[PDB]
């Protein structure tokens, strides 16, 4: 496990995010209900949501867009987001929705989750089925609909460990949390894949992670393992969207 050189980067970066969010109520409040329960926001959305909240930015989005549930159904339901006319209510983004809250506060995050989802071409789904998108479309969406013209997608595939971590440290050092994805290899190519935020590191070279499960099993982890409570372990096909900040 490679360690942060303090003559190049900061000696450590303590957990940046203050949100401890997830994919269900009230984050999904504005998504359709179904007979298999209400649609969930998606890991990509929840992770993007959290980072955008960190910067409380942009004030307002750019344009509009719609996706449909079920995904490629010729007559599915419209799930639309008008970024252009939405002034995001950052003030009412509670750090933790596990308690009670005003509706104002519910709608605050419910919209961000919606929009982030829509902006990534989310294929929405139920609690059992899940909602997924592609990190690549997430980048594209951030640029187009959120105004992050520097947002950029990259895979760990194309970088040696030293180079990858250089970016990880330098970005965290600059105070920029990272949207980050990886997949946990299945027993017969039945892979499981997830998106989350990396919001720090320590002298030891471990990383602070916010998985977006209402802050469950959140904490400092090894970037090569990423193994929350030994249920899963996200090693393969790691990737990120950098260039997200004010």
From TrEMBL:
UniProt superkingdom: Bacteria
Protein name, entry field: Interpain A
Family (UniProt): Belongs to the peptidase C10 family.
Residues annotated as catalytic: 43, 194
